[PDB]
């Protein structure tokens, strides 16, 4: 959806 | 990467592949990088140093293979190329080996979030994991120092962080390693980063987040006993990153 740093 | 396993970008959705175009028709791989925010990718200066003509580089995100497309990939042009002032190379190390690439799509946009494209987190001011932590490196570099080609499939491997005391021992790298670098190796010197892996990330979990702790920079040989891989210590460059992003 939107960037969430470090999420695979 | 020497050893390691083959993977897909789903597993490293912030890895960026940087290529260079040639007046002739071919595009060749240069180095890896990581997506920090929608428009910025961070890599290493030594990758651009010899040919700092931003117009000839192409950046691809969401890429699991080297010269064949992946569905979901995005192609960008380098709008800005920031190399480090104070970058130095000696007979082994690279100092202040960090660079920033602002990317622009042919449509004027930066990266979009997908199942194959994600940003990696930055650490807080001089905050690193402790030696012993297992971190993972990813890239398309050589699988054997003797090879003269790169793999077509993305690879990853896990390495552990070692202290500066260990890395600066005379039979390791002595004072060629500074406080702005970090060293990581496999206990049994079986896996490591290598040529073609420059610029890509050393990711570790810090305070609960997958953090970019280092950038592949140099090493003597690949997977050589008492020759750990050295990386740029991101946590020490935060001010520099900030002043530009
Ligand atoms: N042993 C290593 N981790 C590395 C070795 C090299 C070499 I040889 C060239 C460029 C980058 C790297 S990283």
């Amino acid at each position: 959806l939107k960037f969430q740093c470090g999420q695979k | 990467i020497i050893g390691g396993e083959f993977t897909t970008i789903e597993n490293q959705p912030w890895f960026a592949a940087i290529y260079r175009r040639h007046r002739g028709g071919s595009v060749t791989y240069v180095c890896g990088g990581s997506l920090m925010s929608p428009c910025w990718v961070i890599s290493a200066t030594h990758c651009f140093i010899d040919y700092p003509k931003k117009e000839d580089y192409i950046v691809y995100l969401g890429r699991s293979r080297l010269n064949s497309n992946t569905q979901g990939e995005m192609k960008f042009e380098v709008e800005n190329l920031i190399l480090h002032k104070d970058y130095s190379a000696d007979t082994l190390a690279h100092h202040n080996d960090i660079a920033l690439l602002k990317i622009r799509s042919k449509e004027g946009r930066c990266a979009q979030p997908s199942r194959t494209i994600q940003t990696i987190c930055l650490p807080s001011m001089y905050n690193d994991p402790q030696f012993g932590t297992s971190c993972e490196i990813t890239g398309f570099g050589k699988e054997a120092s003797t090879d003269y080609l790169y793999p077509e499939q993305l690879k990853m491997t896990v390495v552990k962080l070692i202290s500066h005391r260990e890395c600066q021992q005379p039979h390791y790298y002595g004072s060629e390693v500074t406080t702005k670098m970090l060293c990581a190796a496999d206990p049994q010197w079986k896996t490591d980063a290598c040529q073609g892996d420059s610029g890509g990330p050393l990711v570790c979990s810090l305070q609960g987040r997958m953090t970019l702790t280092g950038i592949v920079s140099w090493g003597r040989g690949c997977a050589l006993k008492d020759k750990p891989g050295v990386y740029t210590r991101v946590s020490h460059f935060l001010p520099w990153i900030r002043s530009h992003t």
Side-chain angles (χ1 to χ4, degrees):
Chain A
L1 306 180
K2 174 172 271 299
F3 293 109
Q4 297 202 60
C5 73
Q7 253 86 289
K8 307 184 176 184
Chain B
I1 289 190
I2 315 296
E5 327 76 61
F6 280 115
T7 42
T8 46
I9 188 65
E10 280 63 37
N11 293 282
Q12 287 283 318
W14 41 74
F15 178 83
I18 302 175
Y19 305 70
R20 203 176 62 102
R21 301 158 62 116
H22 297 61
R23 278 55 167 118
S26 49
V27 306
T28 52
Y29 189 70
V30 180
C31 290
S34 292
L35 183 69
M36 293 176 22
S37 52
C39 316
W40 298 90
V41 168
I42 185 167
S43 183
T45 277
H46 89 237
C47 292
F48 307 96
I49 280 288
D50 296 342
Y51 192 80
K53 274 300 314 303
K54 71 181 179 184
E55 294 87 356
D56 292 306
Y57 294 94
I58 300 293
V59 175
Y60 280 90
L61 290 176
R63 219 169 165 109
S64 296
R65 292 189 299 163
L66 190 62
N67 293 276
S68 297
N69 322 71
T70 294
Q71 200 73 174
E73 58 183 43
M74 294 185 80
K75 184 184 180 201
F76 300 87
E77 299 187 71
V78 182
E79 198 172 22
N80 296 319
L81 178 62
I82 306 178
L83 301 191
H84 210 275
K85 54 287 301 177
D86 305 322
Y87 163 71
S88 303
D90 51 86
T91 34
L92 247 183
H94 287 290
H95 296 275
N96 301 308
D97 196 24
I98 176 175
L100 288 172
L101 290 87
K102 186 174 180 182
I103 50 175
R104 182 184 176 128
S105 153
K106 57 169 161 162
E107 307 173 90
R109 49 193 59 232
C110 297
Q112 305 292 290
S114 70
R115 35 172 276 249
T116 44
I117 298 175
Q118 184 65 280
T119 48
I120 175 59
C121 304
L122 289 72
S124 320
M125 286 282 237
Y126 314 84
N127 181 45
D128 294 290
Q130 300 284 296
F131 67 99
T133 305
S134 323
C135 300
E136 45 189 63
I137 46 181
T138 185
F140 285 114
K142 300 186 178 186
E143 296 188 82
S145 350
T146 29
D147 297 329
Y148 58 96
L149 284 324
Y150 292 147
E152 282 291 334
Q153 187 72 33
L154 185 61
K155 297 186 72 185
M156 167 194 288
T157 203
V158 176
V159 71
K160 283 188 172 295
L161 297 181
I162 61 173
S163 52
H164 293 87
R165 203 69 63 243
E166 183 181 347
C167 206
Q168 300 179 316
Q169 297 173 74
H171 58 131
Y172 273 57
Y173 294 132
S175 40
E176 279 271 59
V177 185
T178 67
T179 43
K180 289 65 171 64
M181 295 178 199
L182 292 168
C183 299
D186 165 273
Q188 295 175 283
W189 315 92
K190 241 74 127 309
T191 176
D192 192 8
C194 193
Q195 306 164 59
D197 288 309
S198 278
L202 172 60
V203 191
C204 318
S205 21
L206 250 190
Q207 306 157 301
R209 312 168 189 108
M210 280 302 278
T211 303
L212 204 208
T213 284
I215 297 181
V216 185
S217 182
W218 54 285
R220 181 185 175 255
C222 304
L224 288 185
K225 192 181 174 298
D226 298 311
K227 299 300 167 186
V230 192
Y231 303 71
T232 295
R233 193 175 195 176
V234 182
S235 68
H236 285 48
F237 288 91
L238 285 164
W240 184 77
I241 300 179
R242 288 190 181 134
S243 32
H244 298 89
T245 314

